Symmetry: C3
Subunit: 239 residues, 3 copies
């Protein structure tokens, strides 16, 4: 069916690690154009959409298109064996088995059984640095389990208050953190910090994150893996 | 009342972290000259005297003098959010609330409720490197809960023995560790290693530590934070 | 009896640390030529043979030959106090006490009581990089408690399978990992991963490891500490 090679096994491990913090089971659609995966977290709050085009792979050969289901927690522990300079080879041919090869000084091939997996009018859009978003969520985690997103004409505010203390992060476009802001009407919404904590991990300091959300509306978070691999989250608002 | 800015949020976090290992509650006197704090550990063995002059702050503006009480364990977790290059802003104006702002790529402002806090003839003086003192205490921690301090005319000895093993550290002025030694009469005293372990943390390898103590007498340990900020411990002798 | 000095206290600590993961009690024979130690793991599966010649020591003076018994777990915690650039001095003279001196900025001398300790036709030989052997064992640890060693005329295979998954590492001399291979007849044998995990720790990426084993036969693993200090393991085959 296919032979797929990814340079930098550790970074691919982190990518799967990030997803594994929200999902445990997922089906990967392997086509001629790339690898796509759409899964949902157990609490049905987060929709994860991962798109890995062939351009981010050193070698991409798919003889026949196929959808495979893997255990991300199982897959993660194997991918963590790879170093930063290691080469990752994803081979599939034994009908119901996935070959995971970590190639560095030597060639180490894992053999994993495949499993059966069952397969918005945003009024505010902002583009923020991954660092700022990461720090803001962690800050909110100290004071509350809930973080509020506020977007005005020329300012973006992330605010969280608890029983005793409070944290607030304001961005006004003239700052380094905020790169772009497109707001139609004043937009307020609150989300679970615990969820945002998991989907914010793996973010680089230079990563550009696009956030779309509305009043009492789910938010869409999107950034790119190696500039071509798209990772999109759809987070439901806090009840 | 005041606006105080400190460059290097992580180092300030470590300073509060060090104190938090001995005290949980403390009152900070904020004057025109600097910030001072005098608190005592729960076991009433250690007296901590911290002095932070305005010279170690990038911006020091105190409109009106005031004494504020904070939870160091609470304060510590917030200050740990700051990086090494981060900017720390301590703002106070809302009568009973302290604003803690971590400023790096973006501006993140915490809001913390203030709490109500209730506010020797040394015969031997030595000046030792922070590294030597740190290593000696940790060495003593392996063999005993008690460490003995011995100071002669031209030698300084830290010795600890347990039930089975023993460690000894001798300094004779001609060594790199000992920089100065002023001893009137032969001086012996023992102290709790657990306490010395906490007050020795955060010490640099180049820090100069001045130790004063006497026979069956409490010891005074003092070194400087950024060459101007004075940190002084008063440790009672072992019973 | 002797005064022995070793430059690089941290590396010596790691050496004792590695052995301590297999043995808890051992007798060290100190002669004019070097220090040797032969002990066995509690489960009587592994024989450890350590040889430390005088050439790896900065100063080696043995007045009288002697065999001393120490607690490696006790010894390890003391040696961990030493840094990479620290100097280690092993002094013995008080008949039943060992002096352990860590010398860096200052001189810290420990005093430890000595204890009383009670003192193959290989058909396949391979020389492999320490990195490859380390990675292979860790890979096998994920899928099974048993790892199989296979050596053919011009290929060396380490294979492990569990209940659901499988890992395989093939080396064919033309690879970077395999440096030499001398095989008489086809050789197969299996060993416990848990044991191999402990004796593979401390291995460098550039270390050359010589492995000798036979059909249903114990394996001999050998590499060198600082090119002169020989460390040899004798691991029994899996039942």
């Amino acid at each position: 069916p296919f032979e797929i090679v990814f340079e930098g096994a550790k970074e691919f491990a982190q990518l799967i690690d990030t997803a594994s913090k929200l999902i445990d089971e997922a089906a990967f659609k392997v086509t001629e154009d790339g690898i796509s995966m759409r899964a949902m977290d157990p609490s049905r709050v987060v929709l994860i959409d991962l798109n890995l085009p062939s351009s981010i792979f050193s070698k991409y050969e798919v003889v026949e298109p196929e959808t495979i289901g893997v255990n991300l927690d199982h897959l993660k522990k194997i991918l963590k064996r790879g170093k930063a300079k290691d080469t990752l080879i994803l081979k599939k041919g034994e009908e119901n088995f996935l070959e995971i090869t970590i190639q560095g000084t030597a060639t180490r091939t894992f053999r994993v059984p495949l499993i059966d997996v069952e397969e918005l009018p945003f009024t505010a859009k902002v583009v923020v640095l991954g660092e700022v978003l990461k720090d803001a969520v962690k800050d909110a985690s100290l004071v509350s389990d809930s973080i509020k997103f506020i977007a005005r004409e020329n300012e973006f505010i992330m605010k969280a208050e608890g029983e005793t203390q409070e944290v607030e992060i304001k961005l006004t476009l003239e700052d380094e953190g905020l790169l772009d802001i497109e707001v139609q009407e004043e937009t307020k919404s609150a989300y679970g910090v615990s969820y945002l904590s998991d989907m914010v991990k793996g973010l680089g300091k230079a990563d550009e994150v696009t956030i779309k959300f509305g009043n009492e509306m789910p938010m869409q978070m999107e950034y790119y893996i190696r500039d071509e691999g798209r990772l999109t989250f759809l987070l439901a608002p806090r009840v």
